[PDB]
Enzyme design. Structure first.
Site, mmCIF file in Angstrom:
data_model
loop_
_atom_site.group_PDB
_atom_site.id
_atom_site.type_symbol
_atom_site.label_atom_id
_atom_site.label_comp_id
_atom_site.label_asym_id
_atom_site.label_seq_id
_atom_site.Cartn_x
_atom_site.Cartn_y
_atom_site.Cartn_z
ATOM 1 C CE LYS A 157 -1.019 1.815 3.814
ATOM 2 N NZ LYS A 157 -2.247 1.731 4.414
ATOM 3 C CB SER A 290 -12.479 1.479 5.269
ATOM 4 O OG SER A 290 -11.917 0.929 4.105
ATOM 5 C CE1 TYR A 291 -7.657 0.569 8.097
ATOM 6 C CE2 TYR A 291 -6.001 0.744 6.633
ATOM 7 C CZ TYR A 291 -6.654 0.008 7.729
ATOM 8 O OH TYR A 291 -6.041 -1.224 7.946
ATOM 9 C CD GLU A 295 -4.306 4.063 3.501
ATOM 10 O OE1 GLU A 295 -4.283 2.747 3.169
ATOM 11 O OE2 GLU A 295 -3.881 4.572 4.521
ATOM 12 N N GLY A 387 -14.836 -4.000 4.443
ATOM 13 C CA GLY A 387 -14.518 -4.312 5.917
ATOM 14 C C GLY A 387 -13.932 -5.901 5.736
ATOM 15 C CG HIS A 566 11.754 28.322 10.287
ATOM 16 N ND1 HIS A 566 10.528 28.678 10.052
ATOM 17 C CD2 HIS A 566 12.426 29.165 9.898
ATOM 18 C CE1 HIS A 566 10.304 29.498 9.240
ATOM 19 N NE2 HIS A 566 11.510 29.950 9.123
ATOM 20 C CD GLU A 571 8.424 26.214 12.084
ATOM 21 O OE1 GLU A 571 8.967 27.028 13.175
ATOM 22 O OE2 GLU A 571 8.585 26.325 10.865
HETATM 23 C C1 LIG Z 1 22.474 30.896 5.654
HETATM 24 C C2 LIG Z 1 21.447 30.878 7.120
HETATM 25 C C3 LIG Z 1 20.671 29.902 7.254
HETATM 26 C C4 LIG Z 1 20.027 29.598 8.173
HETATM 27 N N1 LIG Z 1 18.849 28.695 8.288
HETATM 28 C C5 LIG Z 1 18.121 28.672 9.499
HETATM 29 C C6 LIG Z 1 17.255 27.740 9.617
HETATM 30 O O1 LIG Z 1 16.904 26.837 8.836
HETATM 31 N N2 LIG Z 1 16.329 27.743 10.894
HETATM 32 C C7 LIG Z 1 16.749 28.549 11.806
HETATM 33 O O2 LIG Z 1 16.002 28.628 12.912
HETATM 34 N N3 LIG Z 1 17.485 29.809 11.713
HETATM 35 C C8 LIG Z 1 18.408 29.742 10.560
HETATM 36 N N4 LIG Z 1 19.218 30.801 10.473
HETATM 37 C C9 LIG Z 1 19.485 31.654 11.555
HETATM 38 C C10 LIG Z 1 18.470 32.541 11.594
HETATM 39 O O3 LIG Z 1 18.239 33.331 10.393
HETATM 40 C C11 LIG Z 1 18.479 33.587 12.666
HETATM 41 O O4 LIG Z 1 18.785 33.013 13.752
HETATM 42 C C12 LIG Z 1 17.652 34.904 12.546
HETATM 43 O O5 LIG Z 1 17.481 35.518 11.474
HETATM 44 C C13 LIG Z 1 17.933 35.970 13.698
HETATM 45 O O6 LIG Z 1 16.921 36.940 13.679
HETATM 46 P P1 LIG Z 1 17.194 38.317 14.254
HETATM 47 O O7 LIG Z 1 15.797 39.047 14.605
HETATM 48 O O8 LIG Z 1 18.097 38.268 15.695
HETATM 49 O O9 LIG Z 1 18.158 39.140 13.232
HETATM 50 P P2 LIG Z 1 17.826 39.380 11.790
HETATM 51 O O10 LIG Z 1 16.804 38.321 11.314
HETATM 52 O O11 LIG Z 1 19.288 39.367 10.777
HETATM 53 O O12 LIG Z 1 17.483 40.803 11.429
HETATM 54 C C14 LIG Z 1 18.044 41.828 11.902
HETATM 55 C C15 LIG Z 1 17.620 42.945 11.133
HETATM 56 O O13 LIG Z 1 17.938 44.366 11.659
HETATM 57 C C16 LIG Z 1 18.643 44.992 10.483
HETATM 58 N N5 LIG Z 1 19.588 46.072 11.145
HETATM 59 C C17 LIG Z 1 21.141 45.594 11.472
HETATM 60 N N6 LIG Z 1 21.622 46.864 12.071
HETATM 61 C C18 LIG Z 1 20.465 47.693 11.764
HETATM 62 C C19 LIG Z 1 20.467 49.172 12.038
HETATM 63 N N7 LIG Z 1 21.461 49.736 12.829
HETATM 64 N N8 LIG Z 1 19.450 49.915 12.034
HETATM 65 C C20 LIG Z 1 18.230 49.010 11.552
HETATM 66 N N9 LIG Z 1 18.211 47.836 11.186
HETATM 67 C C21 LIG Z 1 19.298 47.270 11.324
HETATM 68 C C22 LIG Z 1 19.377 43.992 9.616
HETATM 69 O O14 LIG Z 1 19.841 44.459 8.250
HETATM 70 C C23 LIG Z 1 18.460 42.975 9.507
HETATM 71 O O15 LIG Z 1 17.289 43.143 8.501
HETATM 72 C C24 LIG Z 1 20.175 30.769 9.149
HETATM 73 C C25 LIG Z 1 20.991 31.725 9.095
HETATM 74 C C26 LIG Z 1 21.799 31.841 8.007
HETATM 75 C C27 LIG Z 1 22.831 32.795 7.787
HETATM 76 C C1 LIG Z 2 -4.764 -2.964 2.874
HETATM 77 C C2 LIG Z 2 -4.459 -2.918 4.160
HETATM 78 C C3 LIG Z 2 -3.769 -1.856 4.611
HETATM 79 C C4 LIG Z 2 -3.124 -1.616 5.875
HETATM 80 N N1 LIG Z 2 -2.178 -0.624 6.277
HETATM 81 C C5 LIG Z 2 -1.779 -0.866 7.552
HETATM 82 C C6 LIG Z 2 -0.869 0.468 7.922
HETATM 83 O O1 LIG Z 2 -0.371 1.204 6.950
HETATM 84 N N2 LIG Z 2 -0.522 0.246 9.310
HETATM 85 C C7 LIG Z 2 -0.836 -0.719 10.303
HETATM 86 O O2 LIG Z 2 -0.334 -0.436 11.276
HETATM 87 N N3 LIG Z 2 -1.707 -1.576 9.800
HETATM 88 C C8 LIG Z 2 -2.183 -1.794 8.739
HETATM 89 N N4 LIG Z 2 -2.892 -2.517 8.295
HETATM 90 C C9 LIG Z 2 -3.421 -3.583 9.269
HETATM 91 C C10 LIG Z 2 -2.379 -4.609 9.516
HETATM 92 O O3 LIG Z 2 -2.277 -5.405 8.104
HETATM 93 C C11 LIG Z 2 -2.834 -5.544 10.558
HETATM 94 O O4 LIG Z 2 -3.372 -5.122 11.666
HETATM 95 C C12 LIG Z 2 -1.832 -6.686 10.796
HETATM 96 O O5 LIG Z 2 -1.514 -7.324 9.749
HETATM 97 C C13 LIG Z 2 -2.507 -7.659 11.938
HETATM 98 O O6 LIG Z 2 -1.424 -8.957 12.194
HETATM 99 P P1 LIG Z 2 -1.968 -10.354 12.694
HETATM 100 O O7 LIG Z 2 -0.743 -10.754 13.195
HETATM 101 O O8 LIG Z 2 -2.984 -9.728 13.464
HETATM 102 O O9 LIG Z 2 -2.438 -10.878 11.342
HETATM 103 P P2 LIG Z 2 -2.093 -11.100 9.936
HETATM 104 O O10 LIG Z 2 -1.034 -10.200 9.646
HETATM 105 O O11 LIG Z 2 -3.291 -11.382 8.929
HETATM 106 O O12 LIG Z 2 -1.408 -12.822 10.010
HETATM 107 C C14 LIG Z 2 -2.185 -13.904 10.211
HETATM 108 C C15 LIG Z 2 -1.901 -14.840 9.296
HETATM 109 O O13 LIG Z 2 -2.229 -16.209 9.734
HETATM 110 C C16 LIG Z 2 -2.744 -17.074 8.637
HETATM 111 N N5 LIG Z 2 -3.832 -17.921 9.028
HETATM 112 C C17 LIG Z 2 -5.223 -17.767 9.237
HETATM 113 N N6 LIG Z 2 -5.712 -18.873 9.777
HETATM 114 C C18 LIG Z 2 -4.934 -19.739 9.558
HETATM 115 C C19 LIG Z 2 -4.917 -21.045 9.988
HETATM 116 N N7 LIG Z 2 -5.914 -21.709 10.219
HETATM 117 N N8 LIG Z 2 -3.651 -21.792 10.099
HETATM 118 C C20 LIG Z 2 -2.594 -21.138 9.928
HETATM 119 N N9 LIG Z 2 -2.268 -19.868 9.354
HETATM 120 C C21 LIG Z 2 -3.529 -19.082 9.267
HETATM 121 C C22 LIG Z 2 -3.218 -15.922 7.637
HETATM 122 O O14 LIG Z 2 -3.320 -16.279 6.215
HETATM 123 C C23 LIG Z 2 -2.146 -14.799 7.910
HETATM 124 O O15 LIG Z 2 -1.103 -15.211 7.153
HETATM 125 C C24 LIG Z 2 -3.441 -2.825 7.033
HETATM 126 C C25 LIG Z 2 -4.338 -3.852 6.299
HETATM 127 C C26 LIG Z 2 -4.880 -3.783 5.191
HETATM 128 C C27 LIG Z 2 -5.889 -4.809 4.688
#
Ligand SMILES: Cc1cc2nc3c(=O)[nH]c(=O)nc-3n(C[C@H](O)[C@H](O)[C@H](O)COP(=O)(O)OP(=O)(O)OC[C@H]3O[C@@H](n4cnc5c(N)ncnc54)[C@H](O)[C@@H]3O)c2cc1C
Ligand SMILES: Cc1cc2nc3c(=O)[nH]c(=O)nc-3n(C[C@H](O)[C@H](O)[C@H](O)COP(=O)(O)OP(=O)(O)OC[C@H]3O[C@@H](n4cnc5c(N)ncnc54)[C@H](O)[C@@H]3O)c2cc1C
Ligand SMILES: N#CCC(=O)N1CCC(C(N)=O)CC1
Ligand SMILES: N#CCC(=O)N1CCC(C(N)=O)CC1
Lengths: 588, 588
Positions: A157, A290-291, A295, A387, A566, A571
């Site tokens: 699936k 159902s799901y 799906e 079902g 971020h 978030e």
């Molecule tokens: C390349 C890069 C990637 C990043 N990726 C992430 C990320 O994925 N996740 C994350 O959480 N953080 C990330 N960061 C960090 C994040 O950007 C900083 O923590 C955040 O921008 C800090 O915010 P601030 O308000 O302290 O300053 P800033 O966002 O720098 O703002 C300060 C502002 O004041 C201005 N300013 C400066 N002096 C003066 C002044 N005298 N008068 C007026 N305005 C002025 C500046 O020009 C600027 O516009 C990244 C940083 C960089 C460089």
């Molecule tokens: C289309 C689909 C999608 C699903 N997607 C998800 C998902 O994303 N996430 C999730 O958590 N669950 C999902 N499920 C549910 C999940 O498959 C079941 O909850 C899980 O397989 C239960 O496991 P089980 O051990 O109870 O039974 P089963 O995995 O069915 O195993 C029982 C086994 O016993 C065998 N059996 C039966 N009778 C006998 C017998 N008399 N002698 C010997 N063997 C026998 C059967 O043939 C089978 O092989 C999905 C189910 C379906 C149908």
């Protein structure tokens, strides 16, 4: 209290050593057991707070109060001197293989729960048999070891879901500057099935290798419990025999239902057949809501198919219905057609499935809407998703004494025990439990540790998180909003919510206010988070972590004081502030 | 104790109403203020622990003990009748607008923290100015309102990261059945920059709209604090003037450094320049090893560039070094070249940038390795990522008396107050705090509520989760493994870990044992989770939710008793069992 535990542990454990981490005599016994390839549980008395009580209580069995003490299937075997005497006299092997039964544990069903239970029990020296058989579908489909999830559920699936998601990746790629043209690219179903099936086949083989390396007997045969300790087996040659076991775990799962209308069994399929279908379904009717239904219809549409879903009443009954409708609305805006308040009356065959040229047949479907108007349309494939149910009468002679509920599932105590003292049930047939693969694995491993290692930990079935892998995914942990209001009243429930837009969707020009999340809280319990809900990409990755916080009793204040990462979709949960009562819009 | 809170709130608030939800005399006053469009904070006394004690304490300022009471800038204004008398007489507007200062709050710096503080302060009636100016890079690059994250940081870098991630999506699609040939597809840098810059521009404009609809005065002007309450401004015509404010918030951020070597400022660029570069950089050299350096090298390589990174010592100094090395190993196997234990000595120009035909120049880079051997190689672009620093002598006259630390950052109490009682600092210039955008936003929003709405809540700066968006992402919350060992001793640390493979990687034939995760735990404290670490796709989405659990004190048993969502990458955290002490392999 301690005495009752010790007696239960000694009676069921297969081979168990009571020990202390310091004692060299215990180490000397450990070494001889390792050299003779004897697996066993071990309890280090100096690691448990009431080891002094356990040491004294052991004397009720052995007449001695020291460590080491080694037991086999309820019988004291000796101290250090006595064990080594059995070792150097070549008597020790026969001691540990002495049993009233063929096996310490028989697992009926080789799926999620059953494989987990069997592998775990074998680690503590329990002699274990795992039986698995796959009754074919009406058109003949069959598959290998591992159960529903591995062969015809979660694994194929989500792989096909991924193939659907990749269609939007090819679309989004152009806006980020890649030179492809999405409109000139098509999908090949059989290439996908081949790849999916190859991975499934490597899981089939991986499980057989695992049971071999753990010394678990694997019988590809259908099992039937005829008495509390007697399992009748039928193999692939219809040869019949009886095996006995001390403890019995039922883990046989369910299979898909069919509606009781003409042509259903003969001309349609279920999910059991879909994941290895040799031809593209073509124009497809999915019946159900159902799901599984949503799906499957979801990824068929993304792969380019003409798909319709026939809905009797509501989508995703039992899930938060505001979320359910948003899930439906997205599918309908992205190429899935719906026939609402509609049910099927019969399927007629216009073309037989072209098994040679590898093409589907053609069917005529007739039904009606709840107002009585008529439904009539042609499709190439009809998929029933109405079902699933067990058929325990094929597993369980009524005279054994295992109680069932109204739906045919097994009534268990909170430690998975049935009404027969040595028989247990896990997985989808355990009445009232969430029917999910990780639930069935955790139940199975924890039970094996209780039966054969003296563990006491129980499986916790409350607030298990879910994800519906529709084209826009839907993850959840806890109560729906309507359930929380029913239980505590509208005046005690507060809902914080917001739309959001993934940063990945900006440059690709996707929708501004479709993704959505809410927290459902209880005012009188310090704004405790009762349920979490999110609709959006990677919803399962998003939701999983919060399930630990909800387990621990998280409140709105805990969400507020945690800082976001971020840029992420998740978030948005850390800065929620608009309540539903306020009536302020949740757009951004 | 309660007395001193009420004193602090009254002297700091701009317009504040003490009220009760039940009282219709308060409703009468609220409506009059809403009609006159006067914004104000409101403290509902019938919804506080000791609201009855504040009622009595209010008399110290007003000589009455009843509700409602309205204050303006520390001064009691009147009860119900007195406010209506002022309103009916057209006297209310002048009373609520009279102030010792031009503004209640001046924010210097219009970035992540600054815009968040200013908007929030304006909600509670504070008259607010926000100043922002972008001093150009050495080659003249400049951008609009919003700060570093919005214009030249988190937002453009993750958008370019997504363009690079989409390359592997095109590769994967063939294996999932789609009919495209990835080898025949190429990337267009300038098409990407245009899409990125159009989205950034929609954020510049949105902030200017947001300030206007909040009645915040936005001045595109360089601010300088010359006295505790006096800010000198210089506009785009170099016209100078002075404005005064009650409270001051410094929020001016940092800018990238350059190594003190010939040719660097002349011929190199930084991240400030990369996100709007009008030509593809071509063969590129990245000098540095911070997250900025690796993130940029990462997506340049994924877009098909010829990229080299030059590392003085180690990768990702200050982060868990096992994780850091796995990060770099992935990059090196997917086409990033590394020149390790190497520094630069000088940069020489060979061709000038062709601005007309839109082409990079050509440079010769000379350096040496840590042993003594020499480095010499030509590149079309050279990017420096060797750290960031503030330049507070521009912003802040040293005679005002605001204490800096040895690095040039502002020393603040735990409520962001400087050594001058009405001046505060937030964001990257706050010494010792995590330099992250959600941190700056929370600090700024929470401080605004303490200043103008009587809030008491402080910002919690501990255990803030991070994500490094390298080609394989890396998320973390809490302590690195080495930091935990050092703080508590190796005998008190237990580490659970496991490799994993995303289901999505199976059919696409990606690597088996590359993604990896671990929990660093303290034995003597109930196996508390000290730090969580994950290397894999969607690592930020994975990590975020566990930040809440870690904030609440999660232990290993909390992770164990929570059930997984299947199939996800994140569920692997719910079944960890292999310890490092045991020596068992973590592979799968
Ligand atoms: C390349 C890069 C990637 C990043 N990726 C992430 C990320 O994925 N996740 C994350 O959480 N953080 C990330 N960061 C960090 C994040 O950007 C900083 O923590 C955040 O921008 C800090 O915010 P601030 O308000 O302290 O300053 P800033 O966002 O720098 O703002 C300060 C502002 O004041 C201005 N300013 C400066 N002096 C003066 C002044 N005298 N008068 C007026 N305005 C002025 C500046 O020009 C600027 O516009 C990244 C940083 C960089 C460089
Ligand atoms: C289309 C689909 C999608 C699903 N997607 C998800 C998902 O994303 N996430 C999730 O958590 N669950 C999902 N499920 C549910 C999940 O498959 C079941 O909850 C899980 O397989 C239960 O496991 P089980 O051990 O109870 O039974 P089963 O995995 O069915 O195993 C029982 C086994 O016993 C065998 N059996 C039966 N009778 C006998 C017998 N008399 N002698 C010997 N063997 C026998 C059967 O043939 C089978 O092989 C999905 C189910 C379906 C149908
Ligand atoms: N109604 C009805 C018929 C029905 O549900 N059958 C389909 C499943 C078949 C099987 N998988 O063992 C046999 C039983
Ligand atoms: N704004 C801006 C950029 C700027 O002015 N430079 C910062 C680094 C300076 C240096 N270290 O030699 C060179 C000048």
């Amino acid at each position: 209290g301690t005495s009752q535990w010790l007696r239960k542990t000694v009676d069921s454990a297969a081979v168990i050593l009571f020990s202390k981490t310091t004692c060299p005599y215990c180490k000397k016994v450990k070494d001889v057991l390792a050299e003779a390839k004897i697996k066993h549980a071990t309890i280090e008395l100096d690691q448990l707070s009431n080891g002094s009580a356990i040491q004294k209580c052991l004397a009720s069995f052995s007449k001695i109060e020291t460590v080491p003490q080694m037991f086999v299937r309820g019988k004291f075997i000796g101290d250090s001197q006595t064990v080594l005497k059995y070792y150097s006299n070549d008597e020790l092997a026969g001691i540990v293989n002495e049993s009233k039964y063929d096996y310490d544990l028989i697992v009926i069903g080789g799926g999620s729960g059953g494989l987990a239970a069997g592998k775990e029990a074998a680690k503590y020296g329990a002699k274990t048999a795992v039986l698995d058989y796959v009754e074919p579908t009406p058109i003949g489909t069959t598959w290998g070891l591992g159960g529903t999830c591995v062969n015809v559920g979660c694994i194929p699936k989500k792989l096909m879901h991924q193939a659907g998601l990749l269609s939007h990746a090819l679309e989004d790629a152009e806006h980020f500057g890649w030179s492809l043209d999405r409109s000139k690219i098509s999908h090949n179903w059989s290439t996908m099935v081949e790849g999916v099936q190859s991975h499934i086949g490597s899981l089939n083989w991986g499980y057989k290798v695992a049971l071999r390396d753990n010394q678990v007997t694997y019988l590809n045969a259908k099992g039937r419990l005829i008495s509390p300790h007697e399992v009748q087996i039928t193999d692939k040659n219809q040869k019949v025999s009886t095996i006995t076991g001390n403890k019995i775990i039922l883990a046989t799962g369910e299979r898909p239902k069919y509606p009781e209308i003409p042509g259903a069994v003969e001309y349609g399929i279920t999910s059991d057949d879909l994941f290895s279908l040799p031809y593209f379904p073509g124009k497809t009717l999915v019946i159900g809501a159902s799901y599984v239904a949503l799906e499957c219809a979801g990824f068929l549409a993304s792969l380019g198919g003409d798909v319709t879903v026939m809905v009797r009443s509501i989508l995703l009954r039992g899930f938060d219905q505001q979320m359910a409708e948003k899930v439906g609305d997205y599918m309908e805006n992205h190429g899935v057609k719906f026939a609402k308040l509609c049910v099927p009356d019969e399927i007629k065959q216009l073309k037989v499935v072209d098994t040679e040229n590898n093409k589907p047949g053609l069917l005529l479907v007739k039904g009606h809407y709840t107002d009585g108007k008529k439904f009539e349309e042609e499709f190439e494939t009809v998929i029933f998703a109405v079902g699933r149910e067990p058929q325990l009468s094929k597993v369980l002679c009524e005279t054994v004494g295992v109680k069932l509920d109204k739906n045919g599932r097994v009534v268990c105590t909170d430690d998975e025990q049935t009404t027969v003292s040595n028989v247990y049930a896990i997985g989808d047939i355990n009445a009232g439990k969430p029917q999910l693969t990780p639930v069935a694995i955790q139940a199975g491993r924890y039970l094996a540790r209780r039966l054969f290692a003296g563990a006491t930990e129980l499986t916790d079935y409350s607030n298990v998180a879910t994800t519906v892998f529709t084209p826009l995914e839907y993850g959840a942990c806890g109560l729906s909003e309507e359930d929380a209001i029913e239980k505590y009243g509208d005046k005690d429930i507060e809902v914080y919510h917001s739309n959001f837009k993934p940063l990945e969707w900006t440059v690709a020009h996707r929708e501004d206010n479709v993704c959505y999340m809410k927290l459902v809280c209880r005012k009188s319990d310090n704004m405790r988070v009762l349920g979490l809900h999110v609709l959006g990409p990677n919803a399962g990755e998003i939701t999983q972590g919060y399930a630990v916080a909800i387990k621990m009793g998280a409140t709105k204040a805990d969400f507020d004081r945690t800082i976001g990462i971020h840029p992420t979709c998740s978030e948005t949960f850390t800065t929620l502030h608009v309540t539903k009562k306020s009536g302020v819009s949740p757009i951004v």
